[PDB]
Amino acid sequence: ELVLALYDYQEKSPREVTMKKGDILTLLNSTNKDWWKVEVNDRQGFVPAAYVKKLD
């Protein structure tokens, strides 16, 4: 309960931003205007983050 990926995304292999099921992940803006930045483990996220959890 926070901001699940809503699927998994899985960028490419267990290296880059790759979610699974719903392990959730942090992020910085890009919820309404943008949607290609997050923070799963302190890094320049590149996941969709669209229609996640409308987190303020």
From Swiss-Prot:
Residues 1-56 form the SH3 domain. It comes from the Eukaryota. It is found in: Cytoplasm, Cytoskeleton; Cytoplasm, Cell cortex. Like erythrocyte spectrin, the spectrin-like proteins are capable of forming dimers which can further associate to tetramers. Interacts with ACP1. Belongs to the spectrin family. Morphologically, spectrin-like proteins appear to be related to spectrin, showing a flexible rod-like structure. They can bind actin but seem to differ in their calmodulin-binding activity. In nonerythroid tissues, spectrins, in association with some other proteins, may play an important role in membrane organization. This is Spectrin alpha chain, non-erythrocytic 1. It comes from Gallus gallus. The gene is SPTAN1. The chain holds residues 970 to 1025 of 2477 of the full protein.
